Design a protein around this motif. Sequence first.
Motif, mmCIF file in Angstrom:
data_model
loop_
_atom_site.group_PDB
_atom_site.id
_atom_site.type_symbol
_atom_site.label_atom_id
_atom_site.label_comp_id
_atom_site.label_asym_id
_atom_site.label_seq_id
_atom_site.Cartn_x
_atom_site.Cartn_y
_atom_site.Cartn_z
ATOM 1 N N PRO A 173 0.810 -1.229 0.000
ATOM 2 C CA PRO A 173 0.000 0.000 0.000
ATOM 3 C C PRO A 173 0.842 1.278 0.000
ATOM 4 C CG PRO A 173 0.079 -0.894 2.220
ATOM 5 C CD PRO A 173 0.752 -1.935 1.295
ATOM 6 N N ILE A 174 0.142 2.394 -0.184
ATOM 7 C CA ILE A 174 0.801 3.690 -0.393
ATOM 8 C C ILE A 174 1.376 4.152 0.946
ATOM 9 C CG2 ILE A 174 -1.196 5.273 0.042
ATOM 10 C CD1 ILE A 174 -0.362 6.652 -2.734
ATOM 11 N N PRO A 175 2.514 4.866 0.975
ATOM 12 C CA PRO A 175 3.038 5.380 2.258
ATOM 13 C C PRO A 175 2.247 6.603 2.705
ATOM 14 C CG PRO A 175 4.781 5.194 0.537
ATOM 15 C CD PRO A 175 3.413 5.174 -0.140
ATOM 16 N N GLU A 176 1.590 6.516 3.866
ATOM 17 C CA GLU A 176 0.655 7.564 4.316
ATOM 18 C C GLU A 176 1.385 8.661 5.098
ATOM 19 O OE1 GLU A 176 -2.969 6.108 6.222
ATOM 20 O OE2 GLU A 176 -2.858 4.306 4.995
ATOM 21 N N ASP A 177 2.158 9.450 4.361
ATOM 22 C CA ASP A 177 2.802 10.634 4.921
ATOM 23 C C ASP A 177 1.867 11.844 4.857
ATOM 24 O OD1 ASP A 177 3.000 11.356 2.112
ATOM 25 O OD2 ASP A 177 4.500 12.795 2.776
ATOM 26 N N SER A 178 2.358 13.007 5.312
ATOM 27 C CA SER A 178 1.498 14.187 5.313
ATOM 28 C C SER A 178 1.059 14.585 3.898
ATOM 29 C CB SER A 178 2.200 15.343 6.021
ATOM 30 O OG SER A 178 3.442 15.581 5.387
ATOM 31 N N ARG A 179 1.905 14.393 2.873
ATOM 32 C CA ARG A 179 1.507 14.790 1.517
ATOM 33 C C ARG A 179 0.350 13.923 1.015
ATOM 34 N NH1 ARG A 179 7.172 16.092 -1.895
ATOM 35 N NH2 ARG A 179 8.222 17.102 -0.120
ATOM 36 N N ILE A 180 0.501 12.600 1.134
ATOM 37 C CA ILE A 180 -0.562 11.696 0.690
ATOM 38 C C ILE A 180 -1.826 11.846 1.533
ATOM 39 C CG2 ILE A 180 -1.147 9.299 0.382
ATOM 40 C CD1 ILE A 180 0.832 10.466 -1.666
ATOM 41 N N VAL A 181 -1.699 11.945 2.867
ATOM 42 C CA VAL A 181 -2.905 12.025 3.682
ATOM 43 C C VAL A 181 -3.654 13.324 3.403
ATOM 44 C CG1 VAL A 181 -3.827 12.144 6.061
ATOM 45 C CG2 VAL A 181 -2.070 10.450 5.457
ATOM 46 N N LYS A 182 -2.936 14.463 3.282
ATOM 47 C CA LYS A 182 -3.643 15.725 3.042
ATOM 48 C C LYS A 182 -4.360 15.707 1.695
ATOM 49 C CE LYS A 182 -1.225 19.542 3.335
ATOM 50 N N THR A 184 -5.513 13.027 0.190
ATOM 51 C CA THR A 184 -6.597 12.056 0.253
ATOM 52 C C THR A 184 -7.840 12.677 0.868
ATOM 53 O OG1 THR A 184 -4.954 10.268 0.484
ATOM 54 C CG2 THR A 184 -7.257 9.725 0.978
ATOM 55 N N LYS A 185 -7.648 13.548 1.856
ATOM 56 C CA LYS A 185 -8.765 14.231 2.512
ATOM 57 C C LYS A 185 -9.516 15.162 1.566
ATOM 58 C CE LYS A 185 -7.029 14.497 7.288
ATOM 59 N NZ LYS A 185 -6.881 13.052 7.616
ATOM 60 N N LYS A 186 -8.804 15.812 0.637
ATOM 61 C CA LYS A 186 -9.433 16.657 -0.380
ATOM 62 C C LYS A 186 -10.329 15.843 -1.299
ATOM 63 N N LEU A 187 -10.043 14.559 -1.432
ATOM 64 C CA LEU A 187 -10.677 13.726 -2.435
ATOM 65 C C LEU A 187 -11.781 12.864 -1.871
ATOM 66 C CD1 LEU A 187 -7.504 12.405 -4.397
ATOM 67 C CD2 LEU A 187 -8.963 14.344 -4.990
ATOM 68 N N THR A 188 -11.719 12.528 -0.584
ATOM 69 C CA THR A 188 -12.578 11.486 -0.040
ATOM 70 C C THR A 188 -12.513 11.510 1.477
ATOM 71 O OG1 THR A 188 -13.114 9.125 -0.029
ATOM 72 C CG2 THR A 188 -10.774 9.696 -0.121
ATOM 73 N N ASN A 189 -13.532 10.908 2.094
ATOM 74 C CA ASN A 189 -13.514 10.601 3.516
ATOM 75 C C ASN A 189 -12.983 9.204 3.820
ATOM 76 O OD1 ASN A 189 -14.607 13.115 4.176
ATOM 77 N ND2 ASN A 189 -16.718 12.377 4.081
ATOM 78 N N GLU A 190 -12.770 8.366 2.798
ATOM 79 C CA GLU A 190 -12.179 7.045 2.986
ATOM 80 C C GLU A 190 -10.765 7.133 3.547
ATOM 81 O OE1 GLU A 190 -12.570 3.732 0.291
ATOM 82 O OE2 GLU A 190 -13.570 5.004 -1.177
ATOM 83 N N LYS A 191 -10.374 6.106 4.296
ATOM 84 C CA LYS A 191 -8.999 6.012 4.753
ATOM 85 C C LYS A 191 -8.087 5.865 3.538
ATOM 86 N N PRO A 192 -6.895 6.470 3.559
ATOM 87 C CA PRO A 192 -6.068 6.479 2.349
ATOM 88 C C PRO A 192 -5.687 5.090 1.875
ATOM 89 C CG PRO A 192 -5.258 8.056 3.952
ATOM 90 C CD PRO A 192 -6.330 7.303 4.637
ATOM 91 N N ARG A 193 -5.521 4.137 2.792
ATOM 92 C CA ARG A 193 -5.064 2.812 2.380
ATOM 93 C C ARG A 193 -6.063 2.172 1.430
ATOM 94 N NH1 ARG A 193 -4.486 -2.304 1.526
ATOM 95 N NH2 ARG A 193 -2.813 -3.522 2.517
ATOM 96 N N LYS A 194 -7.327 2.087 1.854
ATOM 97 C CA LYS A 194 -8.367 1.523 1.002
ATOM 98 C C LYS A 194 -8.558 2.364 -0.254
ATOM 99 N N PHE A 195 -8.532 3.691 -0.118
ATOM 100 C CA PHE A 195 -8.797 4.547 -1.272
ATOM 101 C C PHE A 195 -7.782 4.307 -2.384
ATOM 102 C CE2 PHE A 195 -8.347 8.647 -3.498
ATOM 103 C CZ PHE A 195 -9.669 8.791 -3.946
ATOM 104 N N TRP A 196 -6.504 4.352 -2.036
ATOM 105 C CA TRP A 196 -5.488 4.272 -3.064
ATOM 106 C C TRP A 196 -5.290 2.848 -3.557
ATOM 107 C CZ3 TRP A 196 -4.576 8.403 -5.721
ATOM 108 C CH2 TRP A 196 -4.737 9.671 -5.100
ATOM 109 N N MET A 197 -5.604 1.841 -2.739
ATOM 110 C CA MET A 197 -5.587 0.483 -3.274
ATOM 111 C C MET A 197 -6.674 0.290 -4.317
ATOM 112 S SD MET A 197 -3.803 -2.324 -3.205
ATOM 113 C CE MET A 197 -3.048 -1.661 -1.709
ATOM 114 N N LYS A 198 -7.859 0.901 -4.123
ATOM 115 C CA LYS A 198 -8.898 0.731 -5.136
ATOM 116 C C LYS A 198 -8.487 1.390 -6.437
ATOM 117 N N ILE A 199 -7.869 2.559 -6.340
ATOM 118 C CA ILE A 199 -7.390 3.253 -7.524
ATOM 119 C C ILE A 199 -6.274 2.460 -8.190
ATOM 120 C CG2 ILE A 199 -6.133 5.313 -8.185
ATOM 121 C CD1 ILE A 199 -7.858 6.755 -6.106
#
Length: 242
Positions: A173-182, A184-199
């Motif tokens: 899965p994607i590394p959930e640092d401040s850049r990725i987490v911030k 992800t929040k603009k894009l969705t309320n899903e947790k980043p792990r599930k969100f980016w795995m689906k993508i």
Amino acid sequence: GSHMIARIIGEIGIEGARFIEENIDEQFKALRYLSKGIDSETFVKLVIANSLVSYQLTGKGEQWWWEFAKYFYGRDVKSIYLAYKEFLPNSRFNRRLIPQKLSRIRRVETFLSTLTEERIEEYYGDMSSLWGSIARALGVDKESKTVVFSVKMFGYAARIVLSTFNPYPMEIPIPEDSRIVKLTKKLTNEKPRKFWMKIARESGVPPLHIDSILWPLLGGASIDSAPPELRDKLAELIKIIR
Ligand SMILES: Nc1nc2c([nH]c(=O)n2[C@H]2C[C@H](O)[C@@H](CO)O2)c(=O)[nH]1
């Protein structure tokens, strides 16, 4: 949103992610520089150790990776633990949580000592096995941001040493640092792990390669060195994520 970003990530592809890794990401440029001034086995060991302490930094991650590369160029490294014990207190960009970071390096030192050039080759052919080996040596969950990140950076170093490219496994899965987490929040309320795995699964681009597309751009890297076909796709992504 999710649908439009998966389409554009799919069009960019592993091909586009690899171009960004090897031509745009300053961290790869830093690694290429270091590779010319230290032996290959030590180079790979140092990149893994550096990844595992690349958090709670000061300034910008890209500056930290250049500091690391300029520091170790030409140095005679034996204990990686002792090298970091001397390096980190003199660092400009890595000054917090230093005892915590050093105890992580101490814990993986035995594992790092197994990385002969033959074993590095085998791990680049089986990065899922490396992923578990690093997690187990650290005593942490493999989903941890720095662990998955260390696999990505191993893949940078290994492709330089071995002169071959293997894609990151889809399952990492994607590394959930401040850049990725911030983002992800603009894009969705899903947790980043599930969100980016689906993508990742929809687009065919493994999450660590998605990270290479997103993370340099989120830091402000220029897309203007990309060839026109790719650059037009990167511009459509930027209008989405900005
Ligand atoms: N996602 C991500 N994180 C990075 C990169 N470079 C770097 O130094 N980091 C830091 C941020 C974080 O503390 C750790 C795990 O994401 O790695 C990078 O390229 N991608």
